Ligand binder design. Structure first.
Ligand SMILES: Cc1cc2nc3c(=O)[nH]c(=O)nc-3n(C[C@H](O)[C@H](O)[C@H](O)COP(=O)(O)OP(=O)(O)OC[C@H]3O[C@@H](n4cnc5c(N)ncnc54)[C@H](O)[C@@H]3O)c2cc1C
Ligand SMILES: Cc1cc2nc3c(=O)[nH]c(=O)nc-3n(C[C@H](O)[C@H](O)[C@H](O)COP(=O)(O)OP(=O)(O)OC[C@H]3O[C@@H](n4cnc5c(N)ncnc54)[C@H](O)[C@@H]3O)c2cc1C
Ligand SMILES: [Mg+2]
Ligand SMILES: [Mg+2]
Ligand SMILES: [Mg+2]
Lengths: 547, 537
């Protein structure tokens, strides 16, 4: 704090590697400019506006990871300062203590962050402070791929692939930061109490966040932070290594597995614990210059396109929301079809949230969502269709707000886009087939021996495998013979699906004859894209049928 | 006149991409004439073990060349078709008009060695240039074998790795200009003494008649170069629709056994269509464009899902080069010696005639006798049922029957595919019932019974729910539709559940006896088996 100080404000991108904003904050070590790493609980940033217990713990685990790494490389001189209040109020009064030359941040391209960031930009113009903004949460610059497509984001996944190949490959991750020679600031102890500088790392209880509806089914647990994200990346980079030397995927690898352990990095990518560019260019360097022939779920393995294509799905949804604050709703949302959803049935909606629908796979997935906060992509498709076009004809907004609260990742743009991609695509009639919107048939495909169902629906523990997916088929004597009387211990089906899929298919067909014009909306590229999205494989598409 | 060059046709019955032909016209400005020659010596172009369908195909291609030679020369150019010994014909042809060069296309298969070396020792005597050019395969098989250390690659993945080192295959040559080419009209008595055909002969001239049934063949094929080019341009438009769509329709990815005469395997066997023209046409149509979809476990970028099929053809041609025992078990170093049962002429005849009691097996073998072409999934079914997945008979019996009635019937490809499927004892998926059961495959390929009812017409009155398993019908059902297990349709000539049971024991006993799996023709991995048999992958 001799000649001033630079601020690296953390919101997302809670990491030290591949942090251009951190490097720009460390670029004045020679001039004696100090470094101040800060995180502010302003009541919305890092997804704290609508958060449950599982994601708040994940965020606090990442803040501690940054805090422990700073001390491990600065002999204890480096400290992550966690505040709680208005960001513009904290930065102005902190400028009274030490001179702020540059305030470095990572670009949050989502429009819900525009108010927060433009107030800091307006503050720096008043105090003559450099406002440094770096793009590192996404692979490309969202404004660069939007202007390439003519000032509007691509609405289909293929239209996004066509534009990024024009721009080229995304930038490589930056080098690591050296903090052994960096100086920090010891400010006034009373100034810390006024601006609410935490002396200890807070807990979710400090923010009135306690155990959720189910508490916790401690079968799957996730430790946040940059250390665990890099530990899981190397674990997966070796699984791809074995499949790379093998040249093909084992049949058990290409199939969706819902009985596995916490290996997903979607929560580490949302908070920015793991760099998306480091994920991308680690797969690229491991696959380039080796031609392959086998595929993984209809996507080639040559060049790692089956892995890096997943990171483009995330980039494709992040950019569609940039200049659209109504992206989470349908009124005022220009790229979402207006579907006549039924009236809010909060009795059925509560049966969907609590996992009391009478359908085993739906209940087992929603109870895992409440307890553990993570669902497989196949299970997220099932509960989304069952709530919307597939089962109850409820608006996807009621499912988005529930997901954004209990999900570990819960990207405001990725989660909202996936709800519209699946529920509000009227001209993709393959989504109306019960062969893709039936949880009973899918239960036999993902959970053959009822291992997953009985693990998160414990009332079905003793029913034999011949009646797990269809408990209603048991006799009156058999129902009390396995401690499961449908309607008492296990709830009955809140709706008849076979008569519900008929109502919804005709109600959606009614929209198509009224809208012969297909307006620009978030939709699948083609029918082949639906089959890979819903992990169909053997019998999907036109002419595939039931073999 | 002064001299003449001979373009001798054996394979490569075409005018385009014919480097041997271009070498014959290379001395056009010297006053050296041209002599197109095809000799029925009793073995060339697969005429030693041939049926009526393939002989009809060969003669259709010879007429195409003769018709093309007249349209480009206003009647001056003709195709000379002889019948006799090639070295005797060429020697007496040399004293009528001096032969400077004898140009042929390379036949790398060892069954043609004694024929070519016979002509080779003749030209060194009479001081004639023996020009041999490679155009039947994508690469020179010697350059592929020598790159692999002097031995041919025994797995398909080992082959793709070797040709990747060599590089992309050569592109087809330019078309030949025959508008200013001179020919010779020989002495009429010389044409009488050398057995020169005036009219193109018929299959009946070679003691070849209309098979056993013959009339069930209404899906007929017409040989020739210009007609093979029509099939190439036809599929090129189908592939660009998928190229512009970005993916294959599900009905396209599924095998189709009730389709049209679409295949070009017979045209590529006789050389009516150039394989390099086939390769580089698909390569130019898919280049510079990145695709992400796949076709049955193989990518579509660069046309690898199409060009990879042509590499299967080269992979079997290259393996048989220095192995004259490639079509037999004894003395074949690349074939596992499997204890096959003693030859049973009753079950073998029921396999050929299609009287085994299994509907899909009967419909395929009866289609082979009439039309002489089967889908790859149907050739697999009748091959496993004859060998490891049924009767446990030697693959040598099925090879001779296939080399006789097939339209393609490449000596190296057909034998290689027979060993690849039958004698792969260490590929344990090959013995799974998903591959060794035609009943489940019948409901998978021909669901409603359309293909079975037309090639097994004794089952057309049987409804769909009993057409795949006619033995399951009751007493009044075998009479209401009149299909008794005995007089109308034969009983299953073997117990399939018991046969596959005892055959898997013999393969394990073979593996337990062979602690070393010696280098043999085998699949590369289990994934390669799924793609080969059109499985779920
Ligand atoms: C209703 C619904 C809501 C979803 N909400 C989210 C969300 O809030 N956050 C989120 O990251 N993903 C979301 N997804 C996508 C998908 O469910 C997860 O990305 C996936 O389950 C993560 O598992 P994984 O990393 O092991 O899969 P991988 O195949 O390893 O995915 C690699 C990465 O690619 C990205 N990705 C994968 N699939 C998609 C997709 N369909 N759309 C966008 N990005 C994708 C993620 O960042 C993911 O971590 C949602 C999908 C649905 C159907
Ligand atoms: C027991 C058995 C015997 C066979 N005998 C022959 C034969 O005598 N001649 C022959 O050309 N093919 C043979 N094959 C391969 C296969 O049956 C045919 O190549 C294929 O059915 C031709 O149909 P298509 O051209 O429409 O297929 P496509 O997929 O269009 O094939 C493209 C071309 O690639 C080549 N090709 C395709 N598959 C193979 C293969 N497995 N091995 C070698 N070349 C291949 C052929 O030249 C074919 O025309 C045999 C396969 C088996 C199982
Ligand atoms: Mg992951
Ligand atoms: Mg063909
Ligand atoms: Mg399968």
């Amino acid at each position: 704090a001799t000649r001033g100080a630079n601020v690296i404000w953390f919101r997302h991108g809670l990491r030290l590697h591949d942090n251009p904003a951190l490097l720009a904050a460390l670029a004045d070590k020679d001039q004696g400019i100090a470094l101040i790493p800060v995180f502010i609980f302003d009541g919305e940033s890092a997804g704290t506006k609508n958060v449950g217990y599982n994601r708040m713990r994940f965020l606090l685990d990442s803040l501690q990871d940054i805090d422990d790494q700073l001390q491990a490389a600065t002999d204890g001189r480096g400290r992550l300062l966690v505040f709680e209040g208005e960001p513009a109020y904290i930065f102005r009064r902190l400028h009274e203590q030490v001179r702020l030359h540059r305030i470095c941040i990572e670009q949050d391209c989502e429009p819900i962050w525009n108010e927060r960031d433009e107030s800091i930009r307006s503050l720096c113009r008043e105090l003559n402070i450099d406002f440094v903004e770096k793009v590192s949460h996404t692979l490309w610059d969202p404004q660069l791929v939007i202007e390439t497509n003519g000032g509007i984001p691509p609405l289909t996944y293929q239209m996004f692939l066509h534009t990024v190949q024009i721009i080229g490959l995304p930038p490589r991750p930056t080098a690591d930061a050296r903090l052994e020679d960096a100086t920090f600031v010891e400010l006034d102890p009373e100034f810390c109490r006024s601006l609410k500088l935490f002396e200890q790392l807070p807990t979710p209880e400090h923010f009135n966040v306690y155990g959720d509806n189910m508490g916790f089914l401690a079968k799957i647990n996730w430790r946040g932070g940059e250390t665990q994200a890099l530990l899981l990346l190397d674990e997966r980079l070796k699984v791809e290594q074995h499949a790379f030397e093998r040249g093909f995927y084992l049949p058990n690898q290409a199939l969706p597995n819902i009985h596995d352990s916490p290996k997903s990095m979607s929560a580490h990518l949302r908070f920015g614990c793991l760099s998306v560019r480091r994920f991308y260019w680690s797969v690229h360097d491991l696959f380039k210059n080796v031609q392959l022939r086998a595929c993984v779920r209809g996507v080639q393995m040559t060049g790692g396109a089956h892995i890096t294509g997943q990171l483009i799905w995330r980039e494709y949804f992040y950019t569609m929301s940039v200049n659209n604050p109504n992206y989470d709703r349908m009124e005022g949302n220009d790229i979402c079809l207006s579907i006549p959803w039924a009236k809010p049935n909060e009795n059925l909606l509560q049966s969907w949230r609590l996992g009391q629908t009478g359908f085993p796979l739906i209940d087992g997935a929603m109870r895992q969502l409440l307890a553990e906060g993570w669902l497989h992509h196949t299970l997220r498709n099932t509960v989304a269709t069952f709530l919307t076009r597939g089962g109850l004809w409820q608006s996807w907004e009621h499912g988005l707000q529930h997901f954004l609260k209990y999900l570990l990742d819960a990207d405001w743009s990725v989660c909202a886009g996936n709800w519209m991609w699946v529920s509000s695509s009227a001209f993709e009639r393959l989504l109306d087939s019960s062969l893709v919107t039936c949880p009973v048939a899918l239960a036999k495909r993902l959970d053959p021996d009822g291992t997953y169902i009985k693990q998160y629906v414990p009332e079905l523990m003793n029913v034999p495998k011949e009646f797990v997916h269809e408990p209603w088929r048991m006799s009156a004597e058999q129902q009390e013979q396995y401690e499961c009387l449908i309607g008492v211990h296990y709830p009955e089906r809140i709706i008849d699906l076979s008569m519900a899929v008929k109502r919804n298919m005709l109600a959606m067909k009614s929209l198509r004859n009224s809208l012969i014009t297909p307006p620009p909306h978030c939709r699948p590229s083609n029918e082949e894209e639906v089959r890979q999205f819903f992990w169909l494989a053997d019998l999907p598409g036109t002419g595939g049928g039931g073999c």
